[PDB]
Write a protein that binds this ligand. Structure first.
Ligand SMILES: O=C(Nc1ccccc1)C1CC1
Length: 191
């Protein structure tokens, strides 16, 4: 989670798409879905990003519908967005013990127990937080076995990005869980 705003230049693909769905949250606008292999994923837009501006116009108080109408109405040449980094999220770094544990329990993305003497404990990991990202990779919609797989496959150091469930549940509403499994971008970024 970087401090401060950045700017991104987007460009519609052949099909006039950018691979984004936006959601109005507390009078701002937030990224709900990034489509795999899209302009939005190429430029490094991420779930939970706040969009301040589109083409220099402020986003404050827009409908989802309004934000999506703008992205459509804009010319494809150059869409500039002003983006604040995943403001509802926090990243926590942990280290696995020799038994390959960082020391929490989760169910459906949502952390539900911290284990005594664990790294998760030492690091102050919280329950009632949904897991958004593991080691820079979005894992929203993946099944618990697959997250467990990712954590089990990771090195010693594990980096987790997490969002308070109540905010997480507000963002993902109006999106059926198979889009999230099948469509949300779950790839390591390109270089
Ligand atoms: O940062 C957040 N939660 C959190 C904080 C500390 C440890 C673990 C999680 C919420 C505001 C976005």
């Amino acid at each position: 989670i970087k401090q401060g705003i950045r700017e991104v230049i987007l460009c519609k693909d052949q099909d006039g798409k950018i691979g984004l769905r936006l959601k109005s949250i507390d009078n701002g606008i937030f990224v709900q879905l990034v489509q795999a292999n899209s302009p939005a994923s190429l430029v490094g837009l991420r779930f939970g990003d706040q969009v301040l501006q589109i083409n220099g116009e402020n986003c404050a108080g827009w409908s989802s519908d309004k934000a999506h109408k703008v992205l459509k109405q804009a010319f494809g040449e150059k869409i500039t967005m002003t983006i604040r980094d995943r403001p509802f999220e926090r990243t926590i770094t942990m280290h696995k013990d020799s038994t390959g544990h960082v020391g929490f329990i989760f169910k459906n993305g949502k952390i539900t127990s911290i284990v005594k003497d664990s790294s998760a404990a030492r690091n102050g990991l919280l329950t009632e937080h949904n897991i958004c990202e593991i080691n820079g990779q979005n894992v929203i919609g993946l099944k618990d076995s697959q997250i467990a797989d990712i954590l089990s496959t990771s090195g010693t150091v594990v980096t987790i990005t997490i969002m308070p469930a109540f905010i997480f549940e507000h963002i993902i509403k109006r999106m059926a869980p198979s889009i999230m499994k099948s469509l949300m971008d779950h790839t390591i970024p390109e270089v």
